[PDB]
Structures are given as C-alpha cells and as structure tokens.
From a paper:
To explain these observations, we solved the structure of the pre-catalytic Ca2+:8-oxodGTP:Ct ground state ternary complex of the Lys438Asp variant. Surprisingly, 8-oxodGTP adopted the syn-conformation and formed Hoogsteen-like hydrogen bonds with Ct(anti). The primer terminus had rotated ~180° relative to wild type, while still stacking with the 8-oxodG(syn) base. O3′ of the rotated primer terminus was now stabilized by Ca2+ (instead of Na+) bound to the HhH motif through a water molecule. Primer terminal instability appears to be hindered by Lys438, as the primer terminus is more readily displaced in the ground state 8-oxodGTP(syn):Ct(anti) ternary complex of the Lys438Asp variant. Lys438 provides steric constraints for the incoming nucleotide and primer terminus, as substitution of this residue with aspartate results in 8-oxodG(syn) and primer terminal displacement. Although 8-oxodGTP is accommodated in the active site in the syn-conformation opposite Ct in the absence of Lys438, efficient 8-oxodGTP:Ct insertion appears to require 8-oxodG to base-pair using the Watson–Crick edge. The role of Trp434 in active site stabilization is additionally revealed in the Lys438Asp mutant, where this residue contributed to modulation of catalysis by destabilizing the primer terminus.
Pol μ is expected to frequently encounter oxidized nucleotides in its biological roles. We employed time-lapse X-ray crystallography to obtain snapshots of 8-oxodGTP insertion by pol μ on a model DSB substrate.
Numbering used by the authors: 137 to 365, 384 to 397, 410 to 494
Amino acid sequence: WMPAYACQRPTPLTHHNTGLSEALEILAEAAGFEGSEGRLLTFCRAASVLKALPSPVTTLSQLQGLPHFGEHSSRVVQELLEHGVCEEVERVRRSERYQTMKLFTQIFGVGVKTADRWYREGLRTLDDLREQPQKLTQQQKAGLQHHQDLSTPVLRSDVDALQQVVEEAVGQALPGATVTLTGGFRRGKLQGHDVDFLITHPKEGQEAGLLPRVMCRLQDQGLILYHQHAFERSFCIFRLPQPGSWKAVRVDLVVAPVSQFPFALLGWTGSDLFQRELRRFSRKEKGLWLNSHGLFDPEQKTFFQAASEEDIFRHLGLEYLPPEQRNA
DNA sequence: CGGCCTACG
DNA sequence: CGTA
DNA sequence: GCCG
Ligand SMILES: Nc1nc2c([nH]c(=O)n2[C@H]2C[C@H](O)[C@@H](COP(=O)(O)OP(=O)(O)OP(=O)(O)O)O2)c(=O)[nH]1
Ligand SMILES: [Ca+2]
Ligand SMILES: [Ca+2]
Ligand SMILES: [Ca+2]
Ligand SMILES: [Cl-]
Ligand code: NA
C-alpha cells in the first residue's frame, strides 16, 4: 500500500513521525561519513517512508510490509518505541567522529571526503582550520569566513528581498527574463540554508550568456561576497542588507533555456531525496533518463517535450505531486 | 550478486 | 573534488 | 541496508 519509491507517494512538510525519522537520518548521515552511500540511501528511504504515513507509529506491528524496513531499521524503531532512545543512535551522536564530521561538512566547500581527510590529520575545530589556511580552497575560505551567518536559517523575509534584487539585476541584464523561486521555499518550507532561483527567457536562446551579466551587475551593486568567477549555475554568497547592517546568505542561481524550464524547475525544487528517487524510477522502471535538462529515451534517441512539471509526471506514469508534497 | 541521481564549476 |  |  506504501509505494517503494518516494516519487510515488505524497510527502507533506509536516508529518507524524519526526522522532523516528530524525533517528534514522542520524544513522543515514553517519553512514555517509563512513563512505557508504548505499546504507545512507536505505536509512534515508526508511525515514522518508515514515514521513508519508498518515499517523504516528506506536507499535512495531505497524512497520510490517513497509518498504525499506528490514532488520536494522526495524530494531531502531523498536528501541525508540520501547525506551524512547536507541543506543546505536546515541553512540553515534556523542562520538567525536560524528560531531567533527558534521561540523566540517556543514562548511560551504567541504564535503565528506575533505572532512574525513582533515579528521584523519588530527583537525577538530573551525579554529584548527583557520590556523591552516594553506589547506583551504578559495571556496572553503569563503565558507569559513561567513560560517556564522551561513549557520543562521534563511527566512521568508530574506527571500522576498533577495528576489527583488535578483529580479532587478536580471531585468537590467536581459529584458523579459524571469526569476522563479525554487528549492525548499517552493515546497513550502519556512526556512532554508540557501535560496534557490531559476532564471529563463521566453524566447529560446536569448538567455545565452545571461548569468555572467547578472553576476556582474550584482557584484557592481556590492551584493556579492563570493562567487566562482561561460557558466549557467552559480553557488554564491550574497551580502544581504539588513536594518542598519548586512548578513551573508547563500544563494544559488541557475539559468536554463525555456525549452528546459519544466525539467529545471522540477529538479531544483527537490527535495534531494525526491529527485534522486524520481530519477531512479525513470531509469529503472521506465527506461528513460531524467536530469534537469530533459527526459531522454535512449532507444529512440529523443527528448520528451514538456510544457510543465505535470507533463513530466504524466510521461513517467506517475500521479502528479505539487511541490508541497515532494518533501521526501 | 551489484545498484544505489545527476551533471555543472 | 565541490555544489550536496 | 535493503532490494531486484
Ligand atoms: N542538497 C541537494 N540538492 C540536490 C541534490 N540533487 C538534486 O537534484 N538536488 C536539488 C534538489 C534541491 O531542492 C535543490 C536545491 O538544493 P538545496 O540543498 O538548497 O535544497 P533545499 O532548498 O530543499 O534545502 P534547504 O535550503 O531548505 O536546506 O537541488 C543533492 O544531491 N543534494
Ligand atoms: Ca559542505
Ligand atoms: Ca535551498
Ligand atoms: Ca541550494
Ligand atoms: Cl554502503
Ligand atoms: Na521488511
């Protein structure tokens, strides 16, 4: 009754099993820190199944038949239901390894492989990194410089102000170009770690070269603290004005041709797990290859022409889910 | 047993 | 590798 | 870790 892929079922933002899902997500995160993407995926999928249930799980029995629940995930839920705590989860939480890998991977520009190397070298704190700036890329230096602000959740007021300044720069760069808010905010979240914008133009090809012109206009207005610079994606840090001051905010900008807009909108709206599951479903169940540019039939060697996200869902044989039900 | 999303910067 |  |  519970479909196996997250893209086959609605997942609302508010759900009924946060305690259980948070515990499984700890184990998922720790599996990633140890280099097991497969165990990460299973524990994420099991946590996501719980977010899709209509009611709180109160008894072991209620897991029977659910996909992605086997002996390990079931034992974790068992222990939480019976004792309010799972020893394995608590051991991970309080481990030096987990706490330090979380601290380091939370830096913009630092992933698991980098964090693990630094951990093996004996580094433990952000101060330790700042004292060895030779080990840092320019992206990491920016992430570390602005780490305090980047740890502060971005709210909706920040989004609306950011969208106004992005729209102004986009309109100055190319008349008729548009800006669409994507990411978690489009799914209905009230906070995020960054703001995501998708930029296009209704006339195919007019958007070529647009992102450098936007970035230059934002940089000239003093709004850019960091960006990597032809390009179509920018993972930036913006100097966002605040009353009497400013704060650093992570902003992602993507430019796509309008032919690709539905695919880019779907991909960048997420969630991360929802999109990996949708791409897996497409390839493994339907034989079609999905990305943020298109949906390819490798036997006909043709791309599906979609005018909306709904068209993509329909072509994949899936019930349509609005963004606020993609919170897998 | 092997697979596990995707590709741009 | 990073985005993640 | 779970599944095809
Ligand atoms: N984080 C992440 N996002 C991914 C991945 N693959 C993929 O297509 N995306 C898409 C879906 C996300 O909604 C979109 C933007 O990334 P994001 O981390 O800002 O996601 P979010 O807005 O839901 O998160 P947040 O700001 O609320 O923390 O990128 C991936 O592996 N990780
Ligand atoms: Ca990081
Ligand atoms: Ca975001
Ligand atoms: Ca983002
Ligand atoms: Cl694994
Ligand atoms: Na099972």
